[PDB]
Amino acid sequence: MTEYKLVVVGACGVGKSALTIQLIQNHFVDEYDPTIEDSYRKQVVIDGETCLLDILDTAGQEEYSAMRDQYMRTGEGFLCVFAINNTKSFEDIHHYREQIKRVKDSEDVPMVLVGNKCDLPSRTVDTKQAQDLARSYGIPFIETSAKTRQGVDDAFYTLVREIRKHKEK
Ligand SMILES: Nc1nc2c(ncn2[C@@H]2O[C@H](COP(=O)(O)OP(=O)(O)O)[C@@H](O)[C@H]2O)c(=O)[nH]1
Ligand SMILES: [Mg+2]
């Protein structure tokens, strides 16, 4: 069956692990070690296609930088996550965008921008500012809550759809 290799990136604490675990296991994890990096696989149906999602939940620095370059080169699409109550996490998106493009040496890399923690009252990044950034990149923007599951399937399935559009060219 078709496999899609997805990589979830973003600053520490934005909800990469909580988003991934909601997708895979359908529960919200309140506490998951910020230093754990692991991969998960799940069979899903997207637009009638039975496929396997192979998802790497990243944790930042690696023992050796070659390990970062390896997952960036093999990954087919990237979920770039910030938290709507953490402006620094939003600013860091610029760094992830640039680094992934540089490792892959490509200007066309399937990516989706995710603003997580949308259930929280505290917000420092309004939707408009994130829409403006996504428009500048030419990629979709989705607001999510790993707690309530709002937008979770959409974020991952939209990324698969972006990979499909890239592959058909
Ligand atoms: N309220 C709320 N809390 C969240 C959400 N996503 C993650 N969290 C919490 O934010 C903290 C960091 O989440 P985590 O998944 O460990 O972030 P990571 O470092 O990016 O993997 C944890 O305490 C989670 O419970 C969300 O959508 N809403
Ligand atoms: Mg984590």
PDB file of all heavy atoms in Angstrom, residues 11-18 28-32 34 57 116-120 144-147, ligand 1:
ATOM      1  N   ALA A  11       9.015  24.216  17.477  1.00  0.00           N
ATOM      2  CA  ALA A  11       9.698  24.463  18.738  1.00  0.00           C
ATOM      3  C   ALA A  11       9.192  23.549  19.849  1.00  0.00           C
ATOM      4  O   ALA A  11       8.083  23.013  19.804  1.00  0.00           O
ATOM      5  CB  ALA A  11       9.464  25.909  19.170  1.00  0.00           C
ATOM      6  N   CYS A  12      10.027  23.384  20.872  1.00  0.00           N
ATOM      7  CA  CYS A  12       9.633  22.590  22.021  1.00  0.00           C
ATOM      8  C   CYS A  12       8.379  23.175  22.650  1.00  0.00           C
ATOM      9  O   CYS A  12       8.252  24.392  22.800  1.00  0.00           O
ATOM     10  CB  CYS A  12      10.758  22.601  23.051  1.00  0.00           C
ATOM     11  SG  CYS A  12      10.567  21.353  24.319  1.00  0.00           S
ATOM     12  N   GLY A  13       7.444  22.301  23.006  1.00  0.00           N
ATOM     13  CA  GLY A  13       6.266  22.680  23.760  1.00  0.00           C
ATOM     14  C   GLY A  13       5.054  23.089  22.955  1.00  0.00           C
ATOM     15  O   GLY A  13       4.049  23.485  23.562  1.00  0.00           O
ATOM     16  N   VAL A  14       5.092  22.987  21.622  1.00  0.00           N
ATOM     17  CA  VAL A  14       3.982  23.485  20.813  1.00  0.00           C
ATOM     18  C   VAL A  14       2.874  22.453  20.652  1.00  0.00           C
ATOM     19  O   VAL A  14       1.759  22.813  20.240  1.00  0.00           O
ATOM     20  CB  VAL A  14       4.432  23.960  19.419  1.00  0.00           C
ATOM     21  CG1 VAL A  14       5.427  25.109  19.541  1.00  0.00           C
ATOM     22  CG2 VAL A  14       4.993  22.794  18.590  1.00  0.00           C
ATOM     23  N   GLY A  15       3.147  21.190  20.943  1.00  0.00           N
ATOM     24  CA  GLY A  15       2.174  20.131  20.831  1.00  0.00           C
ATOM     25  C   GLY A  15       2.433  19.123  19.721  1.00  0.00           C
ATOM     26  O   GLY A  15       1.483  18.469  19.278  1.00  0.00           O
ATOM     27  N   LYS A  16       3.679  18.987  19.257  1.00  0.00           N
ATOM     28  CA  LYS A  16       3.980  18.002  18.223  1.00  0.00           C
ATOM     29  C   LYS A  16       3.592  16.604  18.687  1.00  0.00           C
ATOM     30  O   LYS A  16       2.929  15.854  17.960  1.00  0.00           O
ATOM     31  CB  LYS A  16       5.474  18.034  17.892  1.00  0.00           C
ATOM     32  CG  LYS A  16       5.981  19.392  17.377  1.00  0.00           C
ATOM     33  CD  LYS A  16       7.463  19.329  16.989  1.00  0.00           C
ATOM     34  CE  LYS A  16       8.384  19.092  18.184  1.00  0.00           C
ATOM     35  NZ  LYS A  16       8.304  20.191  19.202  1.00  0.00           N
ATOM     36  N   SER A  17       4.018  16.228  19.893  1.00  0.00           N
ATOM     37  CA  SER A  17       3.710  14.890  20.387  1.00  0.00           C
ATOM     38  C   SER A  17       2.214  14.724  20.633  1.00  0.00           C
ATOM     39  O   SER A  17       1.637  13.687  20.295  1.00  0.00           O
ATOM     40  CB  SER A  17       4.519  14.607  21.654  1.00  0.00           C
ATOM     41  OG  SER A  17       5.915  14.678  21.382  1.00  0.00           O
ATOM     42  N   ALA A  18       1.570  15.736  21.215  1.00  0.00           N
ATOM     43  CA  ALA A  18       0.141  15.632  21.495  1.00  0.00           C
ATOM     44  C   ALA A  18      -0.665  15.508  20.207  1.00  0.00           C
ATOM     45  O   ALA A  18      -1.643  14.752  20.148  1.00  0.00           O
ATOM     46  CB  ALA A  18      -0.321  16.830  22.326  1.00  0.00           C
ATOM     47  N   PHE A  28      -5.802  12.480  24.244  1.00  0.00           N
ATOM     48  CA  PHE A  28      -4.968  13.638  24.529  1.00  0.00           C
ATOM     49  C   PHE A  28      -4.011  13.269  25.658  1.00  0.00           C
ATOM     50  O   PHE A  28      -4.449  12.850  26.737  1.00  0.00           O
ATOM     51  CB  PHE A  28      -5.847  14.810  24.960  1.00  0.00           C
ATOM     52  CG  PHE A  28      -5.075  16.041  25.329  1.00  0.00           C
ATOM     53  CD1 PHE A  28      -4.164  16.591  24.440  1.00  0.00           C
ATOM     54  CD2 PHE A  28      -5.239  16.635  26.565  1.00  0.00           C
ATOM     55  CE1 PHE A  28      -3.449  17.725  24.781  1.00  0.00           C
ATOM     56  CE2 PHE A  28      -4.523  17.764  26.909  1.00  0.00           C
ATOM     57  CZ  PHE A  28      -3.630  18.310  26.013  1.00  0.00           C
ATOM     58  N   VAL A  29      -2.712  13.415  25.413  1.00  0.00           N
ATOM     59  CA  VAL A  29      -1.700  13.135  26.425  1.00  0.00           C
ATOM     60  C   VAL A  29      -1.288  14.449  27.077  1.00  0.00           C
ATOM     61  O   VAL A  29      -0.767  15.354  26.408  1.00  0.00           O
ATOM     62  CB  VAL A  29      -0.495  12.379  25.843  1.00  0.00           C
ATOM     63  CG1 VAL A  29       0.590  12.252  26.893  1.00  0.00           C
ATOM     64  CG2 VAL A  29      -0.919  11.003  25.367  1.00  0.00           C
ATOM     65  N   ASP A  30      -1.530  14.547  28.384  1.00  0.00           N
ATOM     66  CA  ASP A  30      -1.247  15.759  29.140  1.00  0.00           C
ATOM     67  C   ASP A  30       0.242  15.948  29.404  1.00  0.00           C
ATOM     68  O   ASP A  30       0.680  17.082  29.633  1.00  0.00           O
ATOM     69  CB  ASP A  30      -2.001  15.696  30.472  1.00  0.00           C
ATOM     70  CG  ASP A  30      -1.767  16.916  31.337  1.00  0.00           C
ATOM     71  OD1 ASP A  30      -2.198  18.023  30.942  1.00  0.00           O
ATOM     72  OD2 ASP A  30      -1.154  16.769  32.418  1.00  0.00           O
ATOM     73  N   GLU A  31       1.026  14.872  29.379  1.00  0.00           N
ATOM     74  CA  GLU A  31       2.439  14.951  29.733  1.00  0.00           C
ATOM     75  C   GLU A  31       3.196  13.874  28.973  1.00  0.00           C
ATOM     76  O   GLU A  31       2.920  12.681  29.132  1.00  0.00           O
ATOM     77  CB  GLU A  31       2.618  14.782  31.245  1.00  0.00           C
ATOM     78  CG  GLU A  31       4.044  14.947  31.740  1.00  0.00           C
ATOM     79  CD  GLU A  31       4.158  14.787  33.246  1.00  0.00           C
ATOM     80  OE1 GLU A  31       3.127  14.497  33.895  1.00  0.00           O
ATOM     81  OE2 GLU A  31       5.278  14.941  33.781  1.00  0.00           O
ATOM     82  N   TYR A  32       4.150  14.302  28.153  1.00  0.00           N
ATOM     83  CA  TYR A  32       4.965  13.412  27.330  1.00  0.00           C
ATOM     84  C   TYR A  32       6.339  14.051  27.243  1.00  0.00           C
ATOM     85  O   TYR A  32       6.453  15.203  26.814  1.00  0.00           O
ATOM     86  CB  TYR A  32       4.338  13.268  25.938  1.00  0.00           C
ATOM     87  CG  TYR A  32       4.996  12.274  24.993  1.00  0.00           C
ATOM     88  CD1 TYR A  32       4.535  10.968  24.885  1.00  0.00           C
ATOM     89  CD2 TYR A  32       6.061  12.656  24.185  1.00  0.00           C
ATOM     90  CE1 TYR A  32       5.131  10.062  24.006  1.00  0.00           C
ATOM     91  CE2 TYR A  32       6.658  11.763  23.304  1.00  0.00           C
ATOM     92  CZ  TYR A  32       6.192  10.471  23.216  1.00  0.00           C
ATOM     93  OH  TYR A  32       6.798   9.596  22.332  1.00  0.00           O
ATOM     94  N   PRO A  34       9.480  15.938  26.750  1.00  0.00           N
ATOM     95  CA  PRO A  34       9.838  16.783  25.599  1.00  0.00           C
ATOM     96  C   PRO A  34      11.083  16.324  24.850  1.00  0.00           C
ATOM     97  O   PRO A  34      11.318  16.810  23.735  1.00  0.00           O
ATOM     98  CB  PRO A  34      10.044  18.173  26.218  1.00  0.00           C
ATOM     99  CG  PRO A  34      10.178  17.943  27.709  1.00  0.00           C
ATOM    100  CD  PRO A  34       9.436  16.680  28.023  1.00  0.00           C
ATOM    101  N   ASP A  57       7.789  12.106  14.986  1.00  0.00           N
ATOM    102  CA  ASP A  57       7.549  13.163  15.963  1.00  0.00           C
ATOM    103  C   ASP A  57       8.915  13.619  16.473  1.00  0.00           C
ATOM    104  O   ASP A  57       9.524  12.956  17.316  1.00  0.00           O
ATOM    105  CB  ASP A  57       6.696  12.582  17.084  1.00  0.00           C
ATOM    106  CG  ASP A  57       6.513  13.532  18.230  1.00  0.00           C
ATOM    107  OD1 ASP A  57       6.612  14.752  17.993  1.00  0.00           O
ATOM    108  OD2 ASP A  57       6.279  13.061  19.369  1.00  0.00           O
ATOM    109  N   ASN A 116      -1.377  25.387  16.720  1.00  0.00           N
ATOM    110  CA  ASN A 116      -1.963  24.482  17.696  1.00  0.00           C
ATOM    111  C   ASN A 116      -2.326  25.206  18.994  1.00  0.00           C
ATOM    112  O   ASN A 116      -1.880  26.331  19.256  1.00  0.00           O
ATOM    113  CB  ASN A 116      -0.981  23.345  17.992  1.00  0.00           C
ATOM    114  CG  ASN A 116      -1.623  22.222  18.776  1.00  0.00           C
ATOM    115  OD1 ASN A 116      -2.759  21.804  18.508  1.00  0.00           O
ATOM    116  ND2 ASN A 116      -0.932  21.774  19.799  1.00  0.00           N
ATOM    117  N   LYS A 117      -3.159  24.533  19.810  1.00  0.00           N
ATOM    118  CA  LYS A 117      -3.619  24.987  21.126  1.00  0.00           C
ATOM    119  C   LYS A 117      -4.734  26.014  20.982  1.00  0.00           C
ATOM    120  O   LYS A 117      -4.894  26.895  21.833  1.00  0.00           O
ATOM    121  CB  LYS A 117      -2.472  25.630  21.919  1.00  0.00           C
ATOM    122  CG  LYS A 117      -1.168  24.826  22.013  1.00  0.00           C
ATOM    123  CD  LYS A 117      -0.703  24.630  23.451  1.00  0.00           C
ATOM    124  CE  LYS A 117       0.656  23.927  23.530  1.00  0.00           C
ATOM    125  NZ  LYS A 117       1.616  24.504  24.528  1.00  0.00           N
ATOM    126  N   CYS A 118      -5.518  25.900  19.913  1.00  0.00           N
ATOM    127  CA  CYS A 118      -6.610  26.821  19.628  1.00  0.00           C
ATOM    128  C   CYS A 118      -7.758  26.778  20.627  1.00  0.00           C
ATOM    129  O   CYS A 118      -8.601  27.678  20.592  1.00  0.00           O
ATOM    130  CB  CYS A 118      -6.975  26.672  18.156  1.00  0.00           C
ATOM    131  SG  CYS A 118      -8.176  25.369  17.810  1.00  0.00           S
ATOM    132  N   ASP A 119      -7.781  25.805  21.535  1.00  0.00           N
ATOM    133  CA  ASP A 119      -8.765  25.776  22.611  1.00  0.00           C
ATOM    134  C   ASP A 119      -8.424  26.724  23.749  1.00  0.00           C
ATOM    135  O   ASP A 119      -9.281  26.980  24.599  1.00  0.00           O
ATOM    136  CB  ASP A 119      -8.842  24.370  23.199  1.00  0.00           C
ATOM    137  CG  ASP A 119      -7.502  23.869  23.640  1.00  0.00           C
ATOM    138  OD1 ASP A 119      -6.639  23.647  22.761  1.00  0.00           O
ATOM    139  OD2 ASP A 119      -7.302  23.749  24.856  1.00  0.00           O
ATOM    140  N   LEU A 120      -7.190  27.221  23.807  1.00  0.00           N
ATOM    141  CA  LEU A 120      -6.783  28.055  24.923  1.00  0.00           C
ATOM    142  C   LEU A 120      -7.328  29.465  24.742  1.00  0.00           C
ATOM    143  O   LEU A 120      -7.387  29.975  23.619  1.00  0.00           O
ATOM    144  CB  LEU A 120      -5.267  28.136  24.981  1.00  0.00           C
ATOM    145  CG  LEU A 120      -4.506  26.917  25.499  1.00  0.00           C
ATOM    146  CD1 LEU A 120      -3.024  27.228  25.594  1.00  0.00           C
ATOM    147  CD2 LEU A 120      -5.056  26.497  26.851  1.00  0.00           C
ATOM    148  N   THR A 144      -5.434  24.085  14.997  1.00  0.00           N
ATOM    149  CA  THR A 144      -5.743  22.802  15.615  1.00  0.00           C
ATOM    150  C   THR A 144      -5.819  22.924  17.130  1.00  0.00           C
ATOM    151  O   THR A 144      -5.276  23.845  17.739  1.00  0.00           O
ATOM    152  CB  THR A 144      -4.691  21.730  15.256  1.00  0.00           C
ATOM    153  OG1 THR A 144      -3.414  22.107  15.788  1.00  0.00           O
ATOM    154  CG2 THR A 144      -4.580  21.529  13.756  1.00  0.00           C
ATOM    155  N   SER A 145      -6.476  21.944  17.735  1.00  0.00           N
ATOM    156  CA  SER A 145      -6.344  21.663  19.157  1.00  0.00           C
ATOM    157  C   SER A 145      -6.148  20.167  19.315  1.00  0.00           C
ATOM    158  O   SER A 145      -7.061  19.388  19.021  1.00  0.00           O
ATOM    159  CB  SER A 145      -7.578  22.108  19.936  1.00  0.00           C
ATOM    160  OG  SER A 145      -7.475  21.636  21.274  1.00  0.00           O
ATOM    161  N   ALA A 146      -4.972  19.769  19.794  1.00  0.00           N
ATOM    162  CA  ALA A 146      -4.762  18.377  20.171  1.00  0.00           C
ATOM    163  C   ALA A 146      -5.650  17.961  21.333  1.00  0.00           C
ATOM    164  O   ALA A 146      -5.901  16.766  21.513  1.00  0.00           O
ATOM    165  CB  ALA A 146      -3.291  18.162  20.539  1.00  0.00           C
ATOM    166  N   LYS A 147      -6.137  18.914  22.121  1.00  0.00           N
ATOM    167  CA  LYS A 147      -6.979  18.580  23.262  1.00  0.00           C
ATOM    168  C   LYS A 147      -8.392  18.206  22.826  1.00  0.00           C
ATOM    169  O   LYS A 147      -8.939  17.191  23.274  1.00  0.00           O
ATOM    170  CB  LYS A 147      -7.024  19.763  24.226  1.00  0.00           C
ATOM    171  CG  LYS A 147      -7.840  19.508  25.477  1.00  0.00           C
ATOM    172  CD  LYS A 147      -7.447  20.490  26.566  1.00  0.00           C
ATOM    173  CE  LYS A 147      -8.446  20.498  27.697  1.00  0.00           C
ATOM    174  NZ  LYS A 147      -8.138  21.615  28.639  1.00  0.00           N
TER     175      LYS A 147
HETATM  176  N1  LIG B   1      -4.544  23.156  25.953  1.00  0.00           N
HETATM  177  C1  LIG B   1      -3.795  22.506  25.043  1.00  0.00           C
HETATM  178  N2  LIG B   1      -2.617  22.008  25.494  1.00  0.00           N
HETATM  179  C2  LIG B   1      -1.817  21.352  24.619  1.00  0.00           C
HETATM  180  C3  LIG B   1      -2.238  21.181  23.237  1.00  0.00           C
HETATM  181  N3  LIG B   1      -1.269  20.494  22.612  1.00  0.00           N
HETATM  182  C4  LIG B   1      -0.294  20.240  23.515  1.00  0.00           C
HETATM  183  N4  LIG B   1      -0.655  20.733  24.703  1.00  0.00           N
HETATM  184  C5  LIG B   1       0.114  20.666  25.939  1.00  0.00           C
HETATM  185  O1  LIG B   1       1.316  21.437  25.731  1.00  0.00           O
HETATM  186  C6  LIG B   1       2.428  20.782  26.371  1.00  0.00           C
HETATM  187  C7  LIG B   1       3.483  20.424  25.336  1.00  0.00           C
HETATM  188  O2  LIG B   1       2.892  19.490  24.445  1.00  0.00           O
HETATM  189  P1  LIG B   1       3.853  18.439  23.705  1.00  0.00           P
HETATM  190  O3  LIG B   1       3.004  17.568  22.835  1.00  0.00           O
HETATM  191  O4  LIG B   1       4.695  17.721  24.732  1.00  0.00           O
HETATM  192  O5  LIG B   1       4.750  19.433  22.821  1.00  0.00           O
HETATM  193  P2  LIG B   1       6.053  19.094  21.940  1.00  0.00           P
HETATM  194  O6  LIG B   1       7.256  19.522  22.755  1.00  0.00           O
HETATM  195  O7  LIG B   1       5.935  19.958  20.723  1.00  0.00           O
HETATM  196  O8  LIG B   1       6.070  17.609  21.627  1.00  0.00           O
HETATM  197  C8  LIG B   1       1.836  19.562  27.074  1.00  0.00           C
HETATM  198  O9  LIG B   1       1.579  19.878  28.442  1.00  0.00           O
HETATM  199  C9  LIG B   1       0.507  19.258  26.399  1.00  0.00           C
HETATM  200  O10 LIG B   1      -0.499  18.769  27.278  1.00  0.00           O
HETATM  201  C10 LIG B   1      -3.523  21.741  22.839  1.00  0.00           C
HETATM  202  O11 LIG B   1      -3.900  21.651  21.657  1.00  0.00           O
HETATM  203  N5  LIG B   1      -4.233  22.398  23.764  1.00  0.00           N
END
